[PDB]
């Protein structure tokens, strides 16, 4: 599933920094129970940055195992070298994931033709559906609507997670792609506006802690009930902003711990423990949302 | 060691995309002959991003072999995970490199305290001298003067490559660090200005194809002869700009091939061959510098 | 009227730079005939910048005279000194304008409290409805949603022309103001998106040359017929961008001349005549729109 | 004339918002005693934006009277309409001012060719020396090096106030103009750096309250003693920043009142009285500079 509220799930860790299956099993049950449409496993919020390839495969396979067919799983699979992106992607064919979320090459700042070739080659070498992932603030490059339109012709490239927060991109992309190409917000604070403009869902950090409200909000949005959806979004808005008061996923792992969803809020360096000030800001956002 | 003109050397490849030893030798001889002060091996311009860790180490070890004690070698050693940066760096202990050019974590956008902990831990697990590298346009992370000041107190953190192009950083950093902390430009177009403000040298892309001019500019600058240095700078200023007309190292590899310094201009995807228009542009810049 | 398509009308000039009543009368008849909801007289596109106060009053009074009750007129009335804004505004009370379009103070970059006091004082000293006008790219200051919410409580401050092109502002403002506060786009290229998000109309430059299409597009938007409106907007999109290929109102006065709506495209220094390249870009946009 | 420390002098007012002659005299005596090189009368810091043309001229004429030949006076003379800039400037012919500080048109955002024509025409209708003033953060217009180069060929266009804070502009401009074209900083926080790169002085806000320190810094800089100059700079650096903690001239007027240099800190709307928090901030900056 590639519509509705999709959670960019945390990778819960014990005090040592190792994946905590008990915590993960709890999150997964919570998402099944709360009507989340799918799980993005080891994406940005899942600390894709800092897991090695072994860990990355382990988490994805463990998520699929615990999900046990109850909710679709999408793997985070980008790389900034094309041959490596192909190679990492091969390892997930026939795994049970429904699709891949693949980020623009980061650091090396390719041209639009380079992005075209990169994503075209990745799609050529798998049967899996590919969701493009654009987030210039993290990668230093911006996948533009024209090039998205070129890529959407590739049978396997089925949508985009647009994380710029630039809402003009929704209809610039939509007019260049087919009615079945999925547009998903990657920016929680603007995601309702993004849906109102014609987007189909969100790949959400807030959904880690407000899964039911997010699923209801996205459903109402899909039905065209924007004023109703916006009541929910207003109660979530502090969390949509304050889950980024320190670098993601520091605030959201702290909030998960606070709600009892995971055992510890431990992360891997260079992510640091939440400051005291951050914890007060996040606590207040959680209370505004009604979760505390 | 870490002063004057330091080349951010290209990793010349064959048509297959593997390192071309004959070409690397020719480049390294060219730098020894030209007066280049040191070589940064497999940094950004050297396609750090698209070589695996073994290929990377093979290139460094080869560069060191070919250098044969005639010119110091600094290895590119970034990682966006601290445990990993430490391992990756440990491999070069006792290699013969004189230092590491270690980039800020990219993509995961750590806090300043995160950056402090990451570099402090790297430095604690090696005796290799470490040069910090700040390039927010590639990384999404900006290592601020205050944090550089904190890090410069670590024994083996010995300097910074400041690739922002923001000249105000030179004196901000310089007043927070001791007199032997090395300040190097990572932005060719502003490097002479950077040295005029108290900088000590440059890790240069332009030096790949103008190694003598760059070594002479930097000597003039260190001796206070800025008017004279600026004459060379004006000759090179179109290179300094047009070597980025397409994503680095696309232009500089072409230029190297056109000057006969390397056999092929092949790069790895997502870097793409230079366009016709980029070629005419870079060619006019080489003519203007009198290299062609 | 403060909904629908409102034209930011040009001030047509003879070869000497003086207002051309014949040309103005033609534009006004054209807007009456084409279903434009209102006319903004001497706003940004009307060269408010370069008319003295005498000329400014003359143009507004001449527009009201020629309009002859057939279409409502709104005057451009900002100043960057509060006492002067009050004083200029007094001169229009009982003139027959339906309202004023008043820009944030430009150049002196006041604080949000300063903007609050400025606009509050202007509204206090007239009975005329006031439309706030936010355009940071021209003024150097950005009127934020919070402060808009404070001002919308003032009986007389009835809406905003939001010219940032930042579509997140639509619902940030809407949730802070009453359902009768009017939100109008000041950015043609994003104005349809702005309406889709909950805005009520546009204060448009494109409407100078595509008045009927703009009025139909805004009407369909108000009815919730976004796909229908977007067909029109796609044919106008080149014009929405290329009317700013050189500084407004250079392109749009050239286009008016080309369509026979005004006698000359003359403007006042520091606005310059359209270049040859600009005229080709604009001509093509006009043909894309179906006007040539 | 146009070198060393030039004060962007405040227009001190009484409680009514009119110029306070006793305060202006005290300031002008303070500058003669302190070694300030010249006074910019009714520029940005002098509330050029909120005085009418007659009030403006009254302040200049008074400043000149009070200066009584002991210190050169430069008048602020911008307009965003060329015909008007010419008239406004003509009024000072034969006044006794030594030059005009003429700002780029603000709000209407002219092309570079427009800026060329505007300043060329101003210069053609006066024999007063003209200093260009580039401050895109206030004006929305950026006068580029290439255009400054074209203008510096006009006989009486004699220098530039570069208030961008972008130090790369110093040598870009310097290589395009003759050796007697004056390059002045308009950004206190970067001014010593600016002179280190070849700049000749600064039109300073900080000099209102630290006139001796600023005159001594600038002399040290012109004599090549940058380390010594930087000591003074570090003393003043919190002023250089915190005099903009609220919109200029709000902080500097308060500071002037606290040091006893002016009777009141009154400004005209839309400038607002300093907040409590801004006051404590500016007070700590004055203590740090040893002025308090
Ligand atoms: K497709
Ligand atoms: K050190
Ligand atoms: K109201
Ligand atoms: K001149």
How many contiguous H segments (helices) and E segments (strands) does chain B have?
Answer: 12, 8
Question: How far, in Å, CA of B253 to CA of B214, rounded?
Answer: 18
Question: How far, in Å, CA of B96 to CA of B65, rounded?
Answer: 9
CA of C129 to the centre of ligand 3 (A): 9
Å between B228 CA and nearest CA of chain A: 35
D4 beta partners: D201
Q: What is the DSSP string of chain D?
A: --SEEEEE----B-TTSSB-HHHHHHHHHHHHHHT--EEEESSGGGTTTTS-HHHHHHHHHHHHHHHTTSS-EEEE---SSHHHHHHHHHTTTTSS--EEEEEPP-SS---HHHHHHHHHHHHHT--S-EEEEE-HHHHS----HHHHHHHTTSTTEEEEEE-S--TTHHHHHHTTS-TTSEEEE--HHHHHHHHHTT--EEEESGGGT-HHHHHHHHHHHHTT-HHHHHHHHHHHHHHHHHTTSSSTTHHHHHHHHHTTSSS-----TTS-PPPHHHHHHHHHHHHHTT--
Residues C4-289: name the CATH superfamily.
Aldolase class I (3.20.20.70)
Question: How far, in Å, CA of C215 to CA of C201, rounded?
Answer: 9
* Contact assignment for D193 to B175 by CB distance below 8 Å: no
Block residue for tokens 């200066």:
D67
Sign, CA torsion A189/A190/A195/A200: negative
SS3 C221: helix
Residue B268, CA distances (Å) to A84, B11, B16, B23, B271 in order:
11, 11, 9, 17, 6
Question: How far, in Å, CA of D82 to CA of D119, rounded?
Answer: 8
For residue B13, the 8-state DSSP code is B
Sign, CA torsion B282/B283/B288/B292: positive
Question: How far, in Å, CA of B207 to CA of B205, rounded?
Answer: 5
Resolution number, Å: 2.0
Q: Which of B49, B114, B138 is facing A271, going by the closest CB pair?
A: B114
Specify whether the CB–CB gap between B188 and B180 falls below 8 A: no
Angle at A211 between CA A207 and CA A217, to 5 degrees: 90
Structure tokens at B174: 């310089």
Structure tokens at B178: 């001791």
Question: How far, in Å, CA of D109 to CA of C179, rounded?
Answer: 35
Question: How far, in Å, CA of D121 to CA of D116, rounded?
Answer: 9
Question: How far, in Å, CA of A172 to CA of A177, rounded?
Answer: 9
Sign, CA torsion C79/C81/C82/C85: negative
* Contact assignment for C168 to A190 by CB distance below 8 Å: yes
CB < 8 Å to B115, chain A: 270
Specify whether the CB–CB gap between B232 and B204 falls below 8 A: no
Structure tokens at A76: 């985070």
Choose among C239, C176, C174, C228: nearest CA to C200.
C174
Instruction: Compute how many other C-beta atoms are within 10 angstroms of the C-beta atom of residue D124.
Output: 11
Burial track D54-63 (b if 16+ CB lie within 10 A, e otherwise): ebbbebbbbb
CA D263 to chain centre: 22
Residue A40 backbone phi and psi in degrees, to 5: -95, 115
Residue D91, CA distances (Å) to D54, D76, D84 in order:
10, 12, 11
Structure tokens at D68: 């009584």
* Contact assignment for A107 to B106 by CB distance below 8 Å: yes
Question: How far, in Å, CA of A254 to CA of A25, rounded?
Answer: 18
CB < 8 Å to C170, chain A: 193
Angle at C245 between CA C240 and CA C250, to 5 degrees: 95
Question: How far, in Å, CA of C12 to CA of A185, rounded?
Answer: 45
SS3 A247: coil
Structure tokens at A165: 């927060």
Hey, what's the torsion of the CAs at C22, C23, C28, C29, to 10 degrees?
A: 70
Q: Which residues contact D82 (CB under 8 A, 6 or more apart)?
A: C268, C269, C270, D117, D118, D121, D122
Q: Which residues contact C8 (CB under 8 A, 6 or more apart)?
A: C40, C43, C44, C45, C46, C203, C204, C205, C207, C208
D99 beta partners: D74
Question: How far, in Å, CA of B256 to CA of B12, rounded?
Answer: 9
Q: Tell me whether A86 touches chain B (CB under 8 Å).
A: no
Q: Which residues contact A43 (CB under 8 A, 6 or more apart)?
A: A8, A9, A76, A101, A133, A203
Structure tokens at C209: 């040359």
Question: How far, in Å, CA of A207 to CA of C3, rounded?
Answer: 37
C133 catalytic, yes or no? yes
For residue B59, the 8-state DSSP code is H
Question: How far, in Å, CA of D281 to CA of D250, rounded?
Answer: 13
* Contact assignment for B82 to A106 by CB distance below 8 Å: no
Query: By what technique were these coordinates determined?
Result: X-ray
Question: How far, in Å, CA of C36 to CA of C25, rounded?
Answer: 15
- Side-chain-facing half-sphere of D110: CA atoms under 13 Å: 29
Q: Which of B164, B165, B166, B168 to mutate to test the interface with D (most CBs of D within 10 A)?
A: B168
Q: Which of B108, B248, B253, B275 to mutate to test the interface with A (most CBs of A within 10 A)?
A: B108
What is the maximum alpha-carbon separation in chain A?
49
Specify whether the CB–CB gap between B6 and B206 falls below 8 A: no
Rounded to the nearest 10 degrees, the angle between the axes of helix B211-222 and helix B188-196 is 20
C16 catalytic, yes or no? no
Specify whether the CB–CB gap between B250 and B272 falls below 8 A: yes
Residue A129, CA distances (Å) to A76, A122, D123 in order:
12, 10, 65
In terms of Cβ atoms closer than 10 Å to its own Cβ (0-12, 13-18, 19+), residue B64 is buried
* Contact assignment for B170 to D193 by CB distance below 8 Å: yes
Question: How far, in Å, CA of A254 to CA of A278, rounded?
Answer: 10
Query: Which residues 224-243 of B are in CB contact (within 8 Å) with A?
Result: none
Question: How far, in Å, CA of B82 to CA of B120, rounded?
Answer: 10
SS3 A157: strand
- Side-chain-facing half-sphere of A16: CA atoms under 13 Å: 3
SS3 B171: helix
Q: Which residues contact A176 (CB under 8 A, 6 or more apart)?
A: A145, A146, A148, A149, A152
CB < 8 Å to C175, chain A: 230, 234
* Extents of the domains making up chain B: 4-289
Specify whether the CB–CB gap between C200 and C255 falls below 8 A: no
Q: What is the DSSP string of C141-191?
A: ----HHHHHHHHTSTTEEEEEE-S--THHHHHHHTTS-TTSEEEES-HHHH
Choose among C33, A45, C87: nearest CA to B109.
A45
Residue B230 parent element (H or E) = helix B226-242
Å between C22 CA and nearest CA of chain A: 39
């Amino acid at each position: 599933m590639f519509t509705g509220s999709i959670v960019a799930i945390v990778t819960p860790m014990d005090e040592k920094g190792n994946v905590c299956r008990a915590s993960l099993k709890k999150l997964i049950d919570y998402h099944v129970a709360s009507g989340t449409s799918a799980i993005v496993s080891v994406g940005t919020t899942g600390e894709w940055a800092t897991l090695n390839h072994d860990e990355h495969a382990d988490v994805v396979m463990m998520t699929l195992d615990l999900a046990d067919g109850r909710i679709p799983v999408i793997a985070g699979t980008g790389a900034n070298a094309t041959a490596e992106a192909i190679s990492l992607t091969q390892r997930f064919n026939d795994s049970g994931i429904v699709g891949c979320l693949t980020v623009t090459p980061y650091y090396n700042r390719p041209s639009q033709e380079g992005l075209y070739q990169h994503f075209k080659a990745i799609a050529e070498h798998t049967d899996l559906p590919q969701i493009l992932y654009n987030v210039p603030s993290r990668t230093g490059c911006d996948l533009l609507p024209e090039t998205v339109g070129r890529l959407a012709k590739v049978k396997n490239i089925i949508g985009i997670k647009e994380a710029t927060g630039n809402l003009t991109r929704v209809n610039q992309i939509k007019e260049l792609v087919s009615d079945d190409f999925v547009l998903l917000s990657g920016d929680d604070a603007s995601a309702l506006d993004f849906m109102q403009l014609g987007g189909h869902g969100v790949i959400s950090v807030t959904a880690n802690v407000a899964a039911r409200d997010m699923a209801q909000m996205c459903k109402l949005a899909a039905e065209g009930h924007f004023a109703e959806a916006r009541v929910i979004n207003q109660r979530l808005m502090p969390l949509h902003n304050k889950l980024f008061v320190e670098p993601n996923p520091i605030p959201v792992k702290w909030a998960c711990k606070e709600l009892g969803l995971v055992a510890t809020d431990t992360l891997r360096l260079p992510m640091t423990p939440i400051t005291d000030s951050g914890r007060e800001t996040v606590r207040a956002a959680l209370k505004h949302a009604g979760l505390l």
